[PDB]
Amino acid sequence: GIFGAIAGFIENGWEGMVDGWYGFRHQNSEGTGQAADLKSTQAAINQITGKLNRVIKKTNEKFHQIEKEFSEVEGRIQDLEKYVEDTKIDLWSYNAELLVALENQHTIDLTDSEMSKLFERTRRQLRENAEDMGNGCFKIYHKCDNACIGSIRNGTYDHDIYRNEALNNRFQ
Amino acid sequence: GIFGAIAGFIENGWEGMVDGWYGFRHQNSEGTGQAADLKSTQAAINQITGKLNRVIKKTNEKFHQIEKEFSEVEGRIQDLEKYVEDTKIDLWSYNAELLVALENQHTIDLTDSEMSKLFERTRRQLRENAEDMGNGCFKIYHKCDNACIGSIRNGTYDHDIYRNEALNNRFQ
Amino acid sequence: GIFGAIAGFIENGWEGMVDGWYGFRHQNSEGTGQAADLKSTQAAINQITGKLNRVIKKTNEKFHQIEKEFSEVEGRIQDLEKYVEDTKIDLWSYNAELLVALENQHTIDLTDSEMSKLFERTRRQLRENAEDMGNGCFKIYHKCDNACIGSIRNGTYDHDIYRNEALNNRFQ
Amino acid sequence: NSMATLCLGHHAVPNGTLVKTITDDQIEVTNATELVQSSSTGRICNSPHQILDGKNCTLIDALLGDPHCDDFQNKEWDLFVERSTAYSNCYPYYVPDYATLRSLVASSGNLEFTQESFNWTGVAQDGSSYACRRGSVNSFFSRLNWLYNLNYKYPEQNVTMPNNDKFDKLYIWGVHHPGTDKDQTNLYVQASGRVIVSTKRSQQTVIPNIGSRPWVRGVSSIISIYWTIVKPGDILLINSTGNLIAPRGYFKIQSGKSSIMRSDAHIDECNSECITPNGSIPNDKPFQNVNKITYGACPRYVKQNTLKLATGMRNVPEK
Amino acid sequence: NSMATLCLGHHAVPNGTLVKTITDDQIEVTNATELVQSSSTGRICNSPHQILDGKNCTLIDALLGDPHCDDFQNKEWDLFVERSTAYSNCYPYYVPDYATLRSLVASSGNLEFTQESFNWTGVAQDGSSYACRRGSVNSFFSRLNWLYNLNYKYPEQNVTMPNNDKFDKLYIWGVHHPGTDKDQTNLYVQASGRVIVSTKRSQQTVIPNIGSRPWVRGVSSIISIYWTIVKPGDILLINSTGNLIAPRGYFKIQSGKSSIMRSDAHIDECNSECITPNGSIPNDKPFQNVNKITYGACPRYVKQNTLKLATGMRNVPEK
Amino acid sequence: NSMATLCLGHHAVPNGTLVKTITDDQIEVTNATELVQSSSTGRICNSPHQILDGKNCTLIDALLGDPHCDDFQNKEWDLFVERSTAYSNCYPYYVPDYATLRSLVASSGNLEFTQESFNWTGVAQDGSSYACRRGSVNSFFSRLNWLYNLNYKYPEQNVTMPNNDKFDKLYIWGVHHPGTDKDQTNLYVQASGRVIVSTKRSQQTVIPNIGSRPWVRGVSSIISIYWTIVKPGDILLINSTGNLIAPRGYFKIQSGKSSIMRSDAHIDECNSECITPNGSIPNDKPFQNVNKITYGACPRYVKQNTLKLATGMRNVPEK
Numbered sequence A, B, C: 001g002i003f004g005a006i007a008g009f010i011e012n013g014w015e016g017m018v019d020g021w022y023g024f025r026h027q028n029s030e031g032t033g034q035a036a037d038l039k040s041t042q043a044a045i046n047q048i049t050g051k052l053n054r055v056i057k058k059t060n061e062k063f064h065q066i067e068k069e070f071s072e073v074e075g076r077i078q079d080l081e082k083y084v085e086d087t088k089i090d091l092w093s094y095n096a097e098l099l100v101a102l103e104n105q106h107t108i109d110l111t112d113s114e115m116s117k118l119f120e121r122t123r124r125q126l127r128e129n130a131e132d133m134g135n136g137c138f139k140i141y142h143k144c145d146n147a148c149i150g151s152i153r154n155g156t157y158d159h160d161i162y163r164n165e166a167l168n169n170r171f172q
Numbered sequence D, E, F: 001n002s003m004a005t006l007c008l009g010h011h012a013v014p015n016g017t018l019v020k021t022i023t024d025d026q027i028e029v030t031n032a033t034e035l036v037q038s039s040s041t042g043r044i045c046n047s048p049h050q051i052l053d054g055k056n057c058t059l060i061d062a063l064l065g066d067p068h069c070d071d072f073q074n075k076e077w078d079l080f081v082e083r084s085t086a087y088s089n090c091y092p093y094y095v096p097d098y099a100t101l102r103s104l105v106a107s108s109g110n111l112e113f114t115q116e117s118f119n120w121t122g123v124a125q126d127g128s129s130y131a132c133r134r135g136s137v138n139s140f141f142s143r144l145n146w147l148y149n150l151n152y153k154y155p156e157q158n159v160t161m162p163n164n165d166k167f168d169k170l171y172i173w174g175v176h177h178p179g180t181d182k183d184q185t186n187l188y189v190q191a192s193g194r195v196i197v198s199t200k201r202s203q204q205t206v207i208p209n210i211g212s213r214p215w216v217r218g219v220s221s222i223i224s225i226y227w228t229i230v231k232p233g234d235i236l237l238i239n240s241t242g243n244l245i246a247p248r249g250y251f252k253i254q255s256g257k258s259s260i261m262r263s264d265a266h267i268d269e270c271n272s273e274c275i276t277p278n279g280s281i282p283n284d285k286p287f288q289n290v291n292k293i294t295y296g297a298c299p300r301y302v303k304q305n306t307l308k309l310a311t312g313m314r315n316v317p318e319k
């Protein structure tokens, strides 16, 4: 992906997460956490549903057209009818092929984007209380029980509550 | 926003900034103020003008063509003449719809990029004398009078003369 | 570019690098050196080769078609034959013009991506032992002989070994 | 020991689908939806479009009134369906613009016929033939009137028929080409006839060619079929010194969503907006590989048989 | 404490327009431009294109030389405009492939006529008529020469006319169809005849067709119109027993940007590159929604009546 | 120091190229590749398509059997190449639908002829002419049979020829239009009469028209050329009073990937799948600017003469 998060600095996906597209796995004194992030999951889903509805909009309604199969040789006028329909099919076949290639390229890049946005969302919250271990994980430098972890996912993490405890462990 | 800055980690835009597209707001001892950033404003405007001129370029000049309205029922040749023009109209109607959709999607994403690029420029410039608050603003840990701000708005901020004042205000 | 690295915070490229597309340049007391990064160079090439292969290929195999030049004025049927071929040529000329513009815009944007990705991959390796200088160069705050700069390019650089020395030199 | 850890991630599945992109020809994502309709039940739904099963009658034969096609009289349709087992059972005939006449009648979408009394004078009417039997009884096309001589005389006919309604009129008529110089004089006493059909903007003149044609149902003659449209305010004008196969009236010629399709599929009782010769198909996908011949609100025909649109992220499992 | 805060942001407008994207159907940007011209003024501008208003005349009428169309002789045009109120007022006629003759004359762009002396011997010329009154008296199509008996005798005509110039020549001729057998003999003496017009490259044969018609504007008859292009080095060869409406010369066929259009829009003093039957439209936008019939440097016709292209960032107020 | 410095960067080149994108229309990348084929060698490659150089012979002349086209008997092709130097050197002929015949023959892709004996009785066969010499000796089209009087009698002909084979037969026949009334009687004794060639689905009538045609190669007459397809289980049937240029047999109607092209390019021994009138072009690129007339696996024709696809990053050189 252009944002190098999915199939990038995050080595692989979680087959064990089924209630969301992006989520948090954590670890602390009371081990065992996993939770999905609804806001980012919802964002990727809305866009994918949005484009999926644009492409199946369904406008073509044709009735009396030209004959497209012929049982007798008629020469010139029939050459043209075949050429017209042949030309039309090739152009729509090209449109269809290019449409899929563009949307799928964009779908990968936007889903990769949401993963990166969630990472930068979490990074800014933690301020100076954590560091990026490189594999999509943060090492949090202070005691953080399950309630403290939930406040990070709820967006209610108060950083200078722990700033002094965290900066100590970081630089000692 | 693919980059998550406009309608992302910047909560809203400034209706009061009429001299540019992107800019700085500041708060210090001497007071508050606001200045547009010319470089990133010019970048976005130039890309949007460039794509606009390619869309408007206009090479399409036809003279004697086929007939497209008919007062008499003729049958086969007229079925073909109508089918040709109908096929042409549907194919161009698709092109115009897809072009606007792609271009607009790219116009939203590139203007989002410029905002993010300006935020990274500012972060790299501030080095270790500032912290990301998560909303588009920086906590600047030292005294920064108007000339110091005017020096950040512009590529000439020497972080080394403020580093010692800033690093002590950050760690205590 | 949308990622702001090529023609962005990298002020220019290196004509002197010939063994790769993206790479490193360093300076110790040991002297200066240069080395390409195989992983990012390969990632960009494989995408461009991939899109180049999508573009240049069959099928457009046509055999008996309509007549497209005429030595005689004929009128109605010949007007239609000319109009059909003129319509087809305009539509493909448009498809060709648009394809190149999209591909080249994306080719430029994905190469900017891989440059930015190599930079962030390196920033995560160095943890708190280096500072972003803002121009594409890092400042490593500990003596690093050719062995460890080769362990950065390599991905074997362990930061816990130099964290004590680096944090001291950063903080005065 | 003051520790903690917080890992961010995304889901995967053990079974992804492959899709195409700008750069990769096949790459794995968590999910996709097909965009090309490639299948069909093989049966035409008879709704919401008014279907008319042609059985063994082509539309042209039902227009003229071939005896075994009388159940098609005054029928309407949104889509007429011609079957490959159709046959002709009346007088052998020929339509110079067969495709054109088949096209315009199919587009009009109805066979509502209206009798008009032309004032034929001094001739016999209702001519019949062995080649066009109704039982063992000789008869003819139900919409055509075969005029021939009465008492060794065929006066030059001249008739006026003005369109004073508010719709256009479609008249179908013909010219008889007898097989021998004697058939001509037995029927029309004159050696060679003539037929002029006019409106204020049309001139169709036919001189019959006397000569032997392929033996068909005991007949070596043939009938040329012609059509003429008379707009409101216009007049229909016919002069003939012989060989006229006269019309009995006009067809109401509408314009709308009506057409014709060749197919051998059966017609079940269901609902489907899109119809093809291979049967009705659903129209939720934007494209279809079934057939380039379609009627109604259909997907667009393309050469591809599968186009996967990705509806998820890249699928990245582990090992 | 010695603080400072530096905030980065973007502008917004209380205004906003909605645009379409790949992902959202309506999303608000700060500004957008319209790409579809949907309104016309209702009037055709008289420049830059040389308009020729046909008024009560059609191009074919002006071509042949209908007396009330005499003012179109040797006129040149970029766009000929035909009006619905046009009428014919000379001898009755019909043109097989009328649409074709109209097309090839319209794209030629002029009616510059050049007299030629055909050696017609033994035959009276300049045949006249009423129903073609050129002010009170009797005359004919200005570009056609009606040949008839000279002292009740009609020698068979056989004349040649070569092309020794560097351009193609267009010849317009006709064939007379009298409505009775007596009319045929009173004009050309002999009964039904033959007309044969040939070049080294083309071959045209018409057999006149004697018999009645809807009598128009007073006469029993009608004329068929034909054309023949003679390339440089080729030859025109006319041989007729009678019933020949001879040409008087050639039209110079050109190739260029000339065409024809049907419209009742008034012509105005203004300038506009693009002409539609609704009147002229601006061509600053890439697409237009006014009419698929266009002439000149025009936007491309599309089905949508509006397509807004975003020219600013996402608009996010500021409540 | 106790300090190191690590710089990241990208490569650059001295030459570089300009490409166009969505935003800029001239921006410099490191490397690009051409997508529009704009040049040809000037020579047609005779592999892998059977190429058949017509030299001085048109496909119609070879079909009929012009003597200098003798080398094309029963020949087949994938692409027939007509040269601008081709001439006709046999009896003057004319084809009403010349483009249609040329098309259907070219698409069929062979002249494989099968003899048939038709059983003409009472007439002389194998008529020849001073205008169609095979060796300074008089002769005729090798695939046509000129029927004329026998001891100054010409009985009316009636002939059948059933299609009991499994494919479609194509018959090529003609009608003779003599220059003078006396030439008509010296050949066919009777005054002009009809030719009626029919099947169960086709119907054709030609009336010979005596008249002075342009003198060509010694004669002022002209032959009209017509074609007829006979389905399997159908029957060809000729009834003619005279003036008949009879067929000697039938051609096979294949249906394949063969066509015809107008070019003067020489033929080399090379290999390329795409052919244009300007010669063969390589198909390694998706578009081409050489000619809109193509045959084979060809790039698609476009109006641009160059479209550079970027194959490298933005080129930012040093100072």
Ligand SMILES: *[C@@H]1O[C@H](CO)[C@@H](O[C@@H]2O[C@H](CO)[C@@H](O[C@H]3O[C@H](CO[C@H]4O[C@H](CO[C@H]5O[C@H](CO)[C@@H](O)[C@H](O)[C@@H]5O)[C@@H](O)[C@H](O)[C@@H]4O)[C@@H](O)[C@H](O[C@H]4O[C@H](CO)[C@@H](O)[C@H](O)[C@@H]4O[C@H]4O[C@H](CO)[C@@H](O)[C@H](O)[C@@H]4O)[C@@H]3O)[C@H](O)[C@H]2NC(C)=O)[C@H](O)[C@H]1NC(C)=O
Binding pocket: D180, D212, D213, D214, D215, D220, F158, F159, F160, F235, F237
């Ligand atoms: C110009 O030239 C053309 C042709 O060269 C002439 O046209 C021809 O005219 C004759 C006379 O009318 C006509 O002859 C009989 O044709 C049909 C054909 O029937 C089936 O046969 C064909 C052909 O396959 C046959 O092939 C071999 C050899 O050729 C035969 O030996 C086989 O038996 C095959 O049948 C086939 O395609 C189909 O299967 C056809 O259905 C035939 O029906 C007629 O025969 C009747 O002849 C008598 C008439 O009374 C009678 O004695 C017979 O019994 C039969 O019909 C009777 O049967 C009924 C009971 O079922 C009775 O109730 C009834 O009353 C009737 O008497 C035709 O006579 C040729 O087909 C025809 N050819 C063409 C190509 O048109 C033309 O006349 C010439 N011009 C002039 C001015 O003369």
Ligand SMILES: *[C@@H]1O[C@H](CO)[C@@H](O[C@@H]2O[C@H](CO)[C@@H](O[C@H]3O[C@H](CO[C@H]4O[C@H](CO)[C@@H](O)[C@H](O)[C@@H]4O)[C@@H](O)[C@H](O[C@H]4O[C@H](CO)[C@@H](O)[C@H](O)[C@@H]4O[C@H]4O[C@H](CO)[C@@H](O)[C@H](O)[C@@H]4O)[C@@H]3O)[C@H](O)[C@H]2NC(C)=O)[C@H](O)[C@H]1NC(C)=O
Binding pocket: E158, E159, E160, E235, F180, F212, F213, F214, F215, F220
């Ligand atoms: C209706 O009106 C048309 C139009 O006028 C008319 O058609 C005309 O018919 C005549 C008679 O056939 C024809 O006459 C000449 O045509 C040839 C033109 O040839 C060109 O080449 C010559 C050399 O390059 C050059 O000198 C010519 O000036 C011309 O540029 C020409 O060949 C013919 O030549 C023969 O003329 C007489 C015939 O008796 C002899 O004097 C000549 O030697 C020559 O051939 C004789 O000798 C050869 C030996 O090789 C011998 O084999 C042969 O039998 C012959 O006797 C003519 O001079 C016109 O060309 C033609 N006009 C056209 C086509 O526009 C119709 O005839 C008219 N209808 C009626 C019923 O009258």
Ligand SMILES: CC(=O)N[C@H]1[C@H](O[C@H]2[C@@H](O)[C@@H](CO)O[C@@H](O[C@H]3[C@H](O)[C@@H](O)[C@H](O)O[C@@H]3CO)[C@@H]2O)O[C@H](CO)[C@@H](O[C@@H]2O[C@H](CO[C@]3(C(=O)O)C[C@H](O)[C@@H](NC(C)=O)[C@H]([C@H](O)[C@H](O)CO)O3)[C@H](O)[C@H](O)[C@H]2O)[C@@H]1O
Binding pocket: E127, E128, E129, E130, E131, E138, E146, E147, E148, E152, E178, E179, E183, E185, E186, E187, E218, E219, E220, E221
């Ligand atoms: C050619 C002509 O004038 N035709 C007239 C026709 O004239 C013939 C008629 O007077 C008879 C009388 O029995 O005499 C013929 O001359 C004979 C005479 O005895 C002797 O001189 C000669 O030796 O022998 C001949 C034997 O035929 C005359 O030729 O009269 C009829 C009846 O009035 C005309 O029909 C009427 O025509 C009207 C329209 O007429 C014009 C016109 O204005 O259009 C006059 C034009 O001059 C004429 N053509 C030419 C080339 O000048 C045209 C043209 O003939 C017609 O339009 C063709 O349809 O007609 C009007 O239509 C009225 O309703 C008719 O009754 C006939 O035109």
Ligand SMILES: CC(=O)N[C@H]1[C@H](O[C@H]2[C@@H](O)[C@@H](CO)O[C@@H](O[C@H]3[C@H](O)[C@@H](O)[C@H](O)O[C@@H]3CO)[C@@H]2O)O[C@H](CO)[C@@H](O[C@@H]2O[C@H](CO[C@]3(C(=O)O)C[C@H](O)[C@@H](NC(C)=O)[C@H]([C@H](O)[C@H](O)CO)O3)[C@H](O)[C@H](O)[C@H]2O)[C@@H]1O
Binding pocket: F127, F128, F129, F130, F131, F138, F146, F147, F148, F152, F178, F179, F183, F185, F186, F187, F218, F219, F220, F221
């Ligand atoms: C049919 C024919 O060849 N006609 C010749 C014609 O011959 C007739 C002429 O001699 C008269 C007068 O004596 O007598 C006729 O025969 C009568 C017979 O004597 C009598 O017993 C019987 O009772 O009645 C018959 C009437 O049928 C002759 O038939 O002579 C003229 C003048 O010489 C010829 O015109 C010239 O033709 C030249 C060459 O023409 C060929 C050619 O090469 O094109 C010869 C071919 O053999 C011939 N085709 C066939 C199938 O026979 C063709 C064909 O007739 C024409 O091409 C058709 O247009 O002509 C020369 O090139 C030039 O064209 C003429 O000056 C006439 O053909």
Ligand SMILES: *[C@@H]1O[C@H](CO)[C@@H](O[C@@H]2O[C@H](CO)[C@@H](O[C@@H]3O[C@H](CO[C@H]4O[C@H](CO)[C@@H](O)[C@H](O)[C@@H]4O)[C@@H](O)[C@H](O[C@H]4O[C@H](CO)[C@@H](O)[C@H](O)[C@@H]4O)[C@@H]3O)[C@H](O)[C@H]2NC(C)=O)[C@H](O)[C@H]1NC(C)=O
Binding pocket: D156, D157, D158, D159, D160, D237, D238, D239, E212, E213, E214, E215, E216, E218
């Ligand atoms: C084929 O079928 C058509 C069917 O319509 C028949 O044509 C109709 O009949 C005749 C033509 O033969 C047409 O009637 C003609 O009208 C002309 C118009 O004249 C006007 O002016 C006169 C004064 O001169 C007025 O009194 C009158 O009200 C008219 O409005 C006349 O020119 C004709 O009359 C001519 O002959 C008589 C007798 O000699 C003279 O007295 C006249 O002065 C004049 O010379 C004639 O009256 C009629 O309009 C045709 N119908 C249509 C719809 O056009 C054919 O007859 C028929 N052919 C056959 C059967 O062979």
Ligand SMILES: *[C@@H]1O[C@H](CO)[C@@H](O[C@@H]2O[C@H](CO)[C@@H](O[C@@H]3O[C@H](CO)[C@@H](O)[C@H](O[C@H]4O[C@H](CO)[C@@H](O)[C@H](O)[C@@H]4O)[C@@H]3O)[C@H](O)[C@H]2NC(C)=O)[C@H](O)[C@H]1NC(C)=O
Binding pocket: E156, E157, E158, E194, E196, E239, E240, E241, E242, F181, F210, F211, F212
């Ligand atoms: C093509 O142009 C030529 C050049 O004018 C033209 O040729 C001429 O045709 C006429 C008509 O056929 C010929 O005139 C004949 O001359 C002979 C003399 O031997 C007469 O005997 C003929 O009489 C016939 O007609 C009578 C009725 O009036 C019959 O009763 C009699 O039995 C004859 O059949 C007739 O007058 C003339 O010879 C030729 N040639 C020339 C040089 O004049 C030809 O008509 C044109 N073709 C067309 C118009 O289709």
Ligand SMILES: *[C@@H]1O[C@H](CO)[C@@H](O[C@@H]2O[C@H](CO)[C@@H](O[C@@H]3O[C@H](CO)[C@@H](O)[C@H](O[C@H]4O[C@H](CO)[C@@H](O)[C@H](O)[C@@H]4O)[C@@H]3O)[C@H](O)[C@H]2NC(C)=O)[C@H](O)[C@H]1NC(C)=O
Binding pocket: D181, D210, D211, D212, F156, F157, F158, F194, F195, F196, F239, F240, F241
């Ligand atoms: C279609 O094919 C058929 C089959 O060959 C063909 O039929 C033939 O037609 C001719 C002409 O119609 C017939 O010949 C005529 O026979 C009648 C008999 O009634 C005679 O009157 C005719 O000769 C003259 O007789 C008198 C002097 O003898 C004259 O006073 C009188 O005026 C006549 O002119 C003439 O010979 C012939 O019998 C038939 N043949 C058969 C087998 O039926 C027809 O011509 C073809 N039609 C085409 C090609 O258009």
Ligand SMILES: *[C@@H]1O[C@H](CO)[C@@H](O[C@@H]2O[C@H](CO)[C@@H](O[C@@H]3O[C@H](CO[C@H]4O[C@H](CO)[C@@H](O)[C@H](O)[C@@H]4O)[C@@H](O)[C@H](O)[C@@H]3O)[C@H](O)[C@H]2NC(C)=O)[C@H](O)[C@H]1NC(C)=O
Binding pocket: B069, D255, E038, E039, E040, E277, E278, E289, E290, E291
């Ligand atoms: C420019 O000129 C164009 C052509 O004149 C205009 O296009 C026309 O736009 C009008 C909009 O008012 C359309 O409106 C009406 O359509 C129906 C016709 O319905 C059917 O009526 C009967 C059915 O029994 C039958 O005669 C036909 O089958 C009709 O289809 C009627 O209410 C009116 O008569 C009127 O036609 C026209 O249909 C449309 N015409 C064409 C040819 O497209 C255009 O609007 C003008 N202006 C602009 C700005 O584009």
Ligand SMILES: *[C@@H]1O[C@H](CO)[C@@H](O[C@@H]2O[C@H](CO)[C@@H](O)[C@H](O)[C@H]2NC(C)=O)[C@H](O)[C@H]1NC(C)=O
Binding pocket: D158, D159, D160
């Ligand atoms: C058939 O022809 C006859 C004779 O020409 C027509 O009778 C006259 O027609 C004209 C115009 O059509 C009328 O003005 C006369 O009034 C008619 N005759 C009488 C005695 O009044 C007849 O009309 C033609 N046939 C038809 C159906 O109109």
Ligand SMILES: *[C@@H]1O[C@H](CO)[C@@H](O)[C@H](O)[C@H]1NC(C)=O
Binding pocket: A146, A147, A148, A150, A151, A154, A156
């Ligand atoms: C988020 O978590 C905190 C602490 O666990 C809790 O107090 C708060 O109510 C939570 N809010 C929501 C919306 O879950």
Ligand SMILES: *[C@@H]1O[C@H](CO)[C@@H](O)[C@H](O)[C@H]1NC(C)=O
Binding pocket: C146, C147, C150, C151, C154, C156
């Ligand atoms: C990478 O290179 C360094 C020396 O420059 C070495 O220490 C290390 O082992 C190398 N990596 C591998 C996998 O051998």
Ligand SMILES: *[C@@H]1O[C@H](CO)[C@@H](O)[C@H](O)[C@H]1NC(C)=O
Binding pocket: E119, E120, E121, E158
């Ligand atoms: C005009 O044509 C006649 C034949 O109808 C001919 O005799 C005469 O010579 C020609 N005139 C001239 C000047 O040649």
